[model samples]
Target chain A: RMKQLEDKVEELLXKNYHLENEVARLKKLVX
Target chain B: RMKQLEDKVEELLXKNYHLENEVARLKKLVX
Candidate 1:
């Protein structure tokens, strides 16, 4: 049987990735 | 403090957290 994706976990992980990138850029800019 | 520097993993984690925030802000800006 096929299984559906876990949307919330996927969404959270995606959002987490974006946040990490923004922080890095800001840190670099400040430094 | 002898645990010492696992610099690469730490650095990566910091970057990842930052990216998450950036995406959230961008999404808000778009909306």
Candidate 2:
């Protein structure tokens, strides 16, 4: 169970990182 | 096992939704 949660957390963090990068790009464009 | 994964997926999806919304808000602010 702990291992499963760890994997899920890693996956979610990866996705969140990508979304943050995308937001940064958009912000740059707007500026 | 399947149910546990499904729950994790659901949680991840919810987090993604919030991140998307946050990005959208930041974009609007930048614009």
Candidate 3:
């Protein structure tokens, strides 16, 4: 259970990094 | 600028919710 949650958390963190990059790109496009 | 970012943030929030649900479903499968 703990291992599963930790793995999911790591996956979410990676997803968040991608989302941040997406936002950066959108910002540049908007500007 | 603010409006664009706000929109992106909202989108991200929705995406985050979906991700959370996915993780929950996966947890059930694991258990």
Candidate 4:
């Protein structure tokens, strides 16, 4: 199965979004 | 069409990874 470049990029966006949330959650816990 | 954002998104992913690693190191520094 060959995934298109856009498909890979889409998941990368989701992962990046998830990381943003993770950082924010940690900040909330501290502050 | 997607080529331009594709490169930009790749850099975003790299920045996200750096932040993720920084959090871990910061915790290590805390302990």
Look at candidate 2 and give me any clashing residue pairs.
Answer: none
Residue runs of model 4 more than 4 Å from their true location after superposition: A1-3, B1-16, B29-31
Candidate 4 local lDDT, A1-31, one digit each (tens): 1256668677877877787786676777667
lDDT of 3 by residue, A1-31 (tens): 4564556557667877876675565556556
Worst 10 residues of 2 chain B by lDDT: B22-31
C-alpha displacement of B9 in model 1, angstroms?
Answer: 26
Model 3: CA > 4 A from native: B1-15, B18-31
**Which residue pairs clash in candidate 3?**
none
TM-score for all models, in order of appearance: 0.39, 0.58, 0.49, 0.55
The Cα error of candidate 3 at residue A22, in Å, is: 0.8
Off by over 4 Å in 2: B1-13, B25-31
Candidate 1, B1-31: lDDT as tens digits: 2123344435555666676566657656553
lDDT of 2 by residue, B1-31 (tens): 7777778688787979887887878877775
For model 3 the local lDDT of residue B31 reads 37
- Candidate 3 reaches a DockQ of 0.04
**Across residues B1-31, which tens digit of lDDT does each residue of candidate 3 receive?**
6556556555766788786676556545453
True contacts kept of each: 0.16, 0.47, 0.00, 0.26
CA lDDT of every candidate = 0.53, 0.79, 0.62, 0.70
lDDT score for residue A28 of model 4: 71
The deviation in Å at residue B6 for candidate 2 is: 9.8
Q: Superpose all Cα atoms of candidate 3 onto the true structure and report the RMSD in Å to 1 decimal.
A: 16.1
User: DockQ for model 2?
Assistant: 0.40
